[PDB]
Amino acid sequence: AHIDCDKECNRRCSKASAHDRCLKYCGICCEKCNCVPPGTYGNEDSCPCYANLKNSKGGHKCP
Secondary structure, eight states: OOOOOHHHHHHHHHOOOHHHHHHHHHHHHHHHHHOOOOSSSGGGOOOHHHHTTOOOOSSOOOO
């Protein structure tokens, strides 16, 4: 089922300069892979669904 990547991301970038560009972006990445890791770090591994989610350049396209 769909997870609250918005309500969750709301924390990831709860105080991020781009509280929007971040969340928003997550609002999409979520669709790509319903994964929301804690804070920000290697934790990604935990949720590769979104981790593996990168661009062509090979950089984290998602926040």
